Amino acid sequence: RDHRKIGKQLDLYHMQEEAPGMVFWHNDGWTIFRELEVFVRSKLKEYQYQEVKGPFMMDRVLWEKTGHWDNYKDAMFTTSSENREYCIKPMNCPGHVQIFNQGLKSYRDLPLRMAEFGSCHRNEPSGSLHGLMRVRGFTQDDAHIFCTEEQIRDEVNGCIRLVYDMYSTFGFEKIVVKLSTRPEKRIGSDEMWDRAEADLAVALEENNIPFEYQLGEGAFYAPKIEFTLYDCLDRAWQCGTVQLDFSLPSRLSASYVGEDNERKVPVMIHRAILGSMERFIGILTEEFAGFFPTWLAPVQVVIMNITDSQSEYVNELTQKLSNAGIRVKADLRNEKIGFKIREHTLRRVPYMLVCGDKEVESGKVAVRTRRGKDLGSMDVNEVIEKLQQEIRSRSLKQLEE
Amino acid sequence: RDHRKIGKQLDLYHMQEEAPGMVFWHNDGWTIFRELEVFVRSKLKEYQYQEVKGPFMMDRVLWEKTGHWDNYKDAMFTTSSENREYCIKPMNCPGHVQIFNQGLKSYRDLPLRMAEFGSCHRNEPSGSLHGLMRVRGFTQDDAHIFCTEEQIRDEVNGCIRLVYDMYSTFGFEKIVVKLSTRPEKRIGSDEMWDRAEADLAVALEENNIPFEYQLGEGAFYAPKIEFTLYDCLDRAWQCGTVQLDFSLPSRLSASYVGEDNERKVPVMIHRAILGSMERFIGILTEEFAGFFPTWLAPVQVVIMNITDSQSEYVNELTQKLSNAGIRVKADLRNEKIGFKIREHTLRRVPYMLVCGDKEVESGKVAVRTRRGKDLGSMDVNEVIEKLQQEIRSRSLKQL
Ligand SMILES: [Zn+2]
Ligand SMILES: [Zn+2]
């Protein structure tokens, strides 16, 4: 039930000591990564988010300006070029503020929702690294919302709604919500922190979401609402987060022209719904015990013959399924049908199609699932249509399940 | 027709001195980036490529083994962690070999085509930086093909076929091909370079490709076929490259079990079709002067109302076009309709849909293009199908 064990079994990824905390995504694991990206992008379109891409490294002087250098130095990778030192970004907020600062912004541009699948690199202590859940290089489903003070309630509510919307796709039953308050090392006045912490609490209360306080776990610039998911050992892992920030836009000279034609500093909301793709995939691997939902499965269908007599038929079906958009593979090895079924069941392939002379002649397929069920024979076109519905709807359950 | 000027006008990207040679991709520019990713992925499924993702940095000992540290040192970004050096990867080849080395490989696994949109970082001299053409951080449509010696001809032929297949989508008329031979500083024996250079020369001639030699411009590990495209002032930019490598797999302990059950070292072919996304987007921007083809346009359709009376009707169409897979925006601002049209025309939006009272009553829409062509009232579903066909076929011209 360990995601590291399942990851090796399904050939999802590997790690080596030439790059501690750095993930080598194999073809099958990268497929899950990219499917989550498509799923997130469908939500970004629905909730009207921009998607951008910031540079990997920026000058150290900018990270000093944000207060990151003083409160985050130990976790930052640095490099140099031409007598100038750069920081590999551990966060995407300063890059998004730089994009916001291009061109004059007015209140008609707010709220401005700017998302990124941003690569973050943090020099986490090597003793704390754990599989995919704690790594040194990860990709956040990050976004930053620039808005007025009057828009805070609506935008924070939208982030909370998005969290439960996207978590419901995976059928999570245990979602623990925490409000992380000010840490010992922080910027911003006590009055600002009181307003920011109260705003997040009111938003949670308004949505009728029970939560507990997590004292001192907030960011150095803003408090956090934390959505916690649990692994196989029931250990708590922070995945969802929404942050209410009154300080960083001022530090980076972000401003917009208000209704009064007076210059105003926008409020910034930081949020990551999945958290990081690496940690969320690890949580998904242990939650499903490798039985990924069909829309997430690296290989959705395996088609396989009894002898050569059905080998040509299998190849035609694999091409037909592939043209229909289904991740399908052919297993034409000289092995017993039970041998093939057991191997691909270990690979957690959702559906295995068995082809004898009976099916070759009838144009049908014998259907078997990774759960050991025998679904019998039904027509190829019916199988295609049901699989497409299961994939497009991102259904959690298989056929007749 | 300078891409830096067009990129500023169209809000595609920006660059700052706090991050020299590093691109801030804005929403509209990142849309073009992602569309090229979709285009490349569609082709790579056709040619049966894996897609992987290597990590950002690896131990400097790795780059010593490949010879990169001796032949590529000054152009590499380096960092530190717990008394160890790490190299920000300037290439994706060592990472792909590491994935190849996971698990036993046999001849039945070859040719193994392993692709990645690999982020590369190179410390290019700051005086050589130029817009999107030459940057310090870029993404290559990279891949490495592990194959046998007998499979070299077919695999290199497939790489060349891929280059002209994907380039024909953009209608490039001038594609200049060069064969770069052994540099001064290189690894591998002379005999291997003789064979590798001859193999690439034979492939170019067999493919009816006229080419010129570029002596000493090959990689320190392999010769390379270079596909050259030209910017607005006809400056030569290397985008496509095919590299034949007989040395790196051995240095990185790559091997497979042959048909004879003997350990054998695979041949590696390095290839990038577009080159880098940053440089190719720059080429496209100057080639089209900001008039991106509809499948590439950041915003394909803008629907505007003349007054408030049609504001609802515009919203329903915007949802209906968006549900059809079209990047569409509604312009309901309190501005004159002529003001709205001019703004989106200057943004090179391919199609602009104007909705008056007669459009609402008839369920139609008035269509005009960024080139000033007026297409009159057209049925809404006729708009969508024609738009879908234009995006589907990746057509160069508006129908
Ligand atoms: Zn942030
Ligand atoms: Zn390479």
Numbering used by the authors:
A (entry chain A): 242 to 642
B (entry chain B): 242 to 640
Paper text:
To test this speculation, we constructed an EcThrRS_G463A mutant. The TSA experiments showed that OB increased the Tm of EcThrRS_G463A by 19.5 °C, which was 14.0 °C less than that of the WT and 1.3 °C less than the Tm of EcThrRS_G463A increased by 36j. In addition, ATP hydrolysis experiments showed that OB had no inhibitory effect on EcThrRS_G463A, indicating that EcThrRS_G463A is also resistant to OB. In contrast, the conformation of EcThrRS_G463A cannot be further opened, and in this binding mode, OB can be competed out by ATP. Consistent with this assumption, when EcThrRS_G463A was cocrystallized in the presence of both OB and ATP, only ATP was resolved in the pocket. The frequency curve of EcThrRS_G463A had only one peak at a DR-A of approximately 14 Å, which was close to and slightly larger than that of EcThrRS_G463S. This finding suggests that the pocket of EcThrRS_G463A cannot be extended so that its DR-A reaches 17 Å and can be effectively suppressed by OB. Furthermore, by comparing the FEL nadir conformation in the computational simulation and the real crystal structures, we found that the FEL nadir conformation of EcThrRS_WT was closer to the open state crystal structure, while the FEL nadir conformations of EcThrRS_G463S and EcThrRS_G463A were more similar to the apo state crystal structures. These analyses suggest that the G463S and G463A mutations affect the conformational space of the ThrRS structure and cannot expose the active site for OB entry and reaction with Tyr462.
Here, we report that a critical glycine residue (Gly463) dominates the motion of threonyl-tRNA synthetase (ThrRS) and the sensitivity of the enzyme to antibiotics. The natural product Obafluorin (OB) is a potent inhibitor of bacterial threonyl-tRNA synthetase (ThrRS). Our previous work showed that OB covalently binds to ThrRS, forming an ester bond with a tyrosine residue in the catalytic center via the highly strained β-lactone ring, making OB the first covalent aaRS inhibitor with demonstrated crystal structures. The binding of OB induces a large conformational change in ThrRS.
